Design a protein around this ligand. Sequence first.
Ligand SMILES: OC[C@H]1O[C@H](O)[C@H](O)[C@@H](O)[C@@H]1O
Ligand SMILES: OC[C@H]1O[C@H](O)[C@H](O)[C@@H](O)[C@@H]1O
Ligand SMILES: [Ca+2]
Ligand SMILES: [Ca+2]
Ligand SMILES: [Mn+2]
Ligand SMILES: [Mn+2]
Lengths: 47, 47, 181, 181
Amino acid sequence: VTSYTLNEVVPLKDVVPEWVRIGFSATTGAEFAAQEVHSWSFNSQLG
Amino acid sequence: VTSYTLNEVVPLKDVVPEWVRIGFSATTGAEFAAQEVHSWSFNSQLG
Amino acid sequence: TETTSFSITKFSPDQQNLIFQGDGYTTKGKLTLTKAVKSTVGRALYSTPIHIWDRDTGNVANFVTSFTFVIDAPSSYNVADGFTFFIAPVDTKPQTGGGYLGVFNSKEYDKTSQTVAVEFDTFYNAAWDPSNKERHIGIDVNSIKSVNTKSWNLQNGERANVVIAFNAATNVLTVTLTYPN
Amino acid sequence: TETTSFSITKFSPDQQNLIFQGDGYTTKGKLTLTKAVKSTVGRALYSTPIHIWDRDTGNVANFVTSFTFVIDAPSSYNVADGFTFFIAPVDTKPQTGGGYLGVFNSKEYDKTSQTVAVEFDTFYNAAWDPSNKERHIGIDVNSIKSVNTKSWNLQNGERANVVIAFNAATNVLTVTLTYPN
Ligand SMILES: OC[C@H]1O[C@H](O)[C@H](O)[C@@H](O)[C@@H]1O
Ligand SMILES: OC[C@H]1O[C@H](O)[C@H](O)[C@@H](O)[C@@H]1O
Ligand SMILES: [Ca+2]
Ligand SMILES: [Ca+2]
Ligand SMILES: [Mn+2]
Ligand SMILES: [Mn+2]
């Protein structure tokens, strides 16, 4: 098992609007690959 | 505390489409009233 | 496996996750569907499509919902017209008003309807409502005529706690309503 | 209090709760964003608006997501271009492709962007990517230039388990990636 962790302070209230959508993005160009999600789960609690 | 329970067999697979929206409805006519939801929570698990 | 869940204990002024139809709107942290006015309809839907069953596996979903509401009448002999929690096709729009409660159009079973509604009926429509002339909780399928009812005593102005659960192994839909006192 | 939650462990052929943009689609129970073709963009969004903070209380939401993905390259020296999980304005549309990964348009901080992206970058764009020329996990805010990175060794074809969490008391966003072996 090979894990990698990164973390940072982002101040969300100031970057993004009160209401947002969430999702996934990918791209190829000159070179390429296939990128695929096999499962996705999410939970948030505001207030 | 005053409770009332009703129950029945509904065969959902046959009444409704695979994908549905859920919600609340109210109406007045000749007579009337104010109807109001103060809180709402939902959970389903398919499969 | 796909699950889904939510909880709003206080409504914003721009609930962007809701669809409002007819006279529904949010004020004071409540969702208000009809104000005490004559002849009006109020509908509010949660916008994500819920996947309630599957062509490919033939599975049906278990589910439960719970909410809180009050009906506030000028008195107890002038109370109309009701309130429904329903499950409908995704493009649902408000149907016929008054005693049809915004979700149906006849008492004749209409298969095109595709709507299951649980109702809290405050007014006897002689033509389909229980002859005992009582206020009632009812389960209706594809028709304004409940396939089953329970008579309940409106406590005008109190906050009712409702829980609705459906069990997919048993095909049983249950409703319980609680008053505090 | 408004909470929200979901889980899809297998994707339907008509995920009606998803928005597909560019080349995204579902097949075989997987969500596929780009096939191994030249020059294409794939985006998929969850459709309900998530309420991430509040004008009136000034609260921000805590949240966590976790997913599984694989990148499948013809070899390991021909691998492009990346993959992102992002948080964006509700009307988001796909931006510039290739090394900009579908969510941005410059390396210059653009406030109008309003996008937080976590990226899994498989190709060095000399102009903004870490000079060490390594594949990396990065956190970017309003720009294709990560404000912070970690170099990671693509295991072409394996299934990565990702968890992203954000803590609203601390304003810290964390990313961990796990390979099985
Ligand atoms: O496929 C890798 C690269 O191909 C093309 O040069 C695109 O312009 C560039 O943005 C991309 O990163
Ligand atoms: O307000 C109570 C009643 O008023 C009007 O007669 C409407 O036609 C009827 O459907 C409704 O039930
Ligand atoms: Ca009636
Ligand atoms: Ca790059
Ligand atoms: Mn009735
Ligand atoms: Mn990069």
